Amino acid sequence: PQITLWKRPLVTIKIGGQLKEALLDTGADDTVIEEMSLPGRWKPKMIGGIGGFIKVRQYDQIIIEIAGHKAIGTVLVGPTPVNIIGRNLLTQIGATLNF
Amino acid sequence: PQITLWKRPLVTIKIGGQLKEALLDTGADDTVIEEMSLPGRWKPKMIGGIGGFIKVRQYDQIIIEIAGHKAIGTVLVGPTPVNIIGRNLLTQIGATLNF
Ligand SMILES: COc1ccc(S(=O)(=O)N(CC(C)C)C[C@@H](O)[C@H](Cc2ccccc2)NC(=O)c2ccc3c(c2)[C@@H](NC(=O)OC(C)(C)C)CCS3)cc1
Ligand SMILES: [Cl-]
Ligand SMILES: [Cl-]
Ligand code: NA
Questions:
Q1: What InterPro entries would the database entry show (chains A, B) (predicted)?
Q2: Fewest C-beta atoms under 10 Å: which of A9, A83, A93, B12?
């Protein structure tokens, strides 16, 4: 699809069998999701944003569908204000910016 | 142009007579620039993201040139770690997300 930016670019994602809303975010290097349970081991990561830094749990090789497109990759879980789909998964679904 | 998302989508902007590098950020509602002077009236605002909120100065009706394309809109100025071109100006240059 072609998504204009007059409203927030929100899509539905599916992770863990559950549908959630998330923001397609070209300014996020990584994907960050609100607290939820994911399988496997996690690793620590600190990420920075506008207001400072937060600690997140890094889960690798997680199956996730984004607007109907299948991806398998890293998901960070932590106290983000909104679910964010970052460039690591935007590239898996073939997204580009165009003007 | 078509910008892929393998790396951060950075572009050159011209704002207030200055050249800056900035991130094309579909996850940002508004445009946020590091500390600089701009002419005209402003009012204080709080904006929030990962890590919490920062205080900015809101300037309305500011002309920017973004990768060669002129726009006008609100610009927020304050202690952002990265210069951000948000949706309020991405719309004006015709930027879309495509996949
Ligand atoms: C109302 O207008 C706005 C309100 C909020 C914002 S925001 O900057 O808070 N943000 C809103 C989102 C969180 C809903 C836009 C977002 O694109 C932001 C845009 C952004 C980008 C970078 C920094 C601050 C904000 N990016 C990140 O928050 C973000 C997310 C994940 C990661 C990073 C940034 C990366 N952060 C980073 O490099 O931080 C340093 C620069 C401090 C080391 C680390 C890898 S993972 C912008 C405009
Ligand atoms: Cl505006
Ligand atoms: Cl349009
Ligand atoms: Na003004």
A1: Aspartic_peptidase_AS, Peptidase_A2_cat, Peptidase_aspartic_dom_sf, Retropepsin-like_cat_dom, Retropepsins
A2: B12
